[PDB]
């Protein structure tokens, strides 16, 4: 019931990989994430890169303590492993669809856990890499995550799509079809 909710520290660290994530959020959106391998802060808006600065090193130091904590809690819990969840996939357009007019398809993968997923796009049954993009893992009060993938595209009557989601919580790859009706 707060006017605003912020996570000035969404820290994640997994044994699988191993891998982790460091980002800040405000009212459910990602302000930035720290490329852990490159030690570089990646803000999500021009407005942010222009007026704010965050030292990447801080992300690395925190993540290091999380690794320290995880190992200790793995032992304390007798190695209780994470439970896989079933992802909910939803595909929709960013702008009203008008043939010939550049647009962007949005693929939302909800209730993700653990945070390990493969989100790719298909164009008329073929793998599509160009114009594809995605958010980091956004947090959820229930402690699961959600990630959003993007596909810039030219609306065509001769072209259809599918958002392909791969997660251990799925018996097999999931396909959510979409086309300019």
């Amino acid at each position: 019931v707060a006017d605003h909710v912020a996570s000035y520290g969404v820290n994640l660290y997994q044994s699988y990989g191993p891998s982790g994530q460091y980002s800040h959020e405000f009212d459910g959106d990602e302000e930035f994430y720290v490329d852990l391998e490159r030690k570089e802060t990646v803000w999500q808006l021009p407005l942010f890169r222009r007026f704010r600065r965050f030292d990447p090193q801080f992300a690395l130091t925190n993540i290091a303590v999380l690794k320290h904590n995880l190992n200790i809690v793995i032992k304390r819990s007798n190695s209780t492993a994470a439970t896989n969840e079933v992802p909910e996939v939803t595909v929709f357009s960013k702008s009203p669809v008008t043939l010939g007019q550049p647009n962007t398809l949005i693929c939302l993968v909800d209730n993700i856990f653990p945070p390990v997923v493969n989100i790719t796009w298909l164009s008329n049954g073929h793998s599509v890499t160009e114009g594809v993009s995605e958010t980091s893992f956004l947090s959820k009060s229930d402690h699961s995550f959600f990630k959003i993938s993007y596909l810039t595209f030219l609306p065509s009557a001769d072209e259809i799509y599918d958002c392909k989601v791969e997660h251990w919580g799925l018996d097999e790859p999931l396909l959510k079809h979409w086309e300019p009706e």
């Binding site: 912020a6 520290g9 969404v10 999500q44 209780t80």
Partner: protein
Amino acid sequence: SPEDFVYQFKGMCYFTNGTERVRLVTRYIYNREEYARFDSDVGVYRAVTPLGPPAAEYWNSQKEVLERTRAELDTVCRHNYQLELRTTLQRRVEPTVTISPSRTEALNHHNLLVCSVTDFYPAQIKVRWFRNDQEETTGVVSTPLIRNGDWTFQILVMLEMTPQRGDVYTCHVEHPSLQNPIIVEWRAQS
């Protein structure tokens, strides 16, 4: 399917009425269970589950850690808010409004006009349907607020209607980014 051991730490700030009321909550999670936390409303670390006593106890036994944490309400929450105030909180992106017919698939023996309000921010928004000189209250259905993830929102409001020559429909949209409301019109039969 490999086994995964996940750890999560969340440093969260809750704001109500500017910085009149500010609440700090740090959460330690193992997989999906928050086993320990610190909430500024109480002021001390708490084992939320039997997995946290070793943690809460360790941290509560250290004076500087308790104080330092308590102080984060200011050094972190209130601090960042100031940066949020001249950036996020003043960000304004006007919505583009569009009206288009239902198509087909049957909207329930009753046609449909779709008023799509797209790419706006912040979330606060008001959309209204008019039929000539009267406002439509019934037959209006809206999708929940939709988060695109790129710091923009979208929302769709359909109106159940029967096309009749002469009738005119308009979608009125109110958002904090515009001094005047956006008004789009659709004329039945033409």
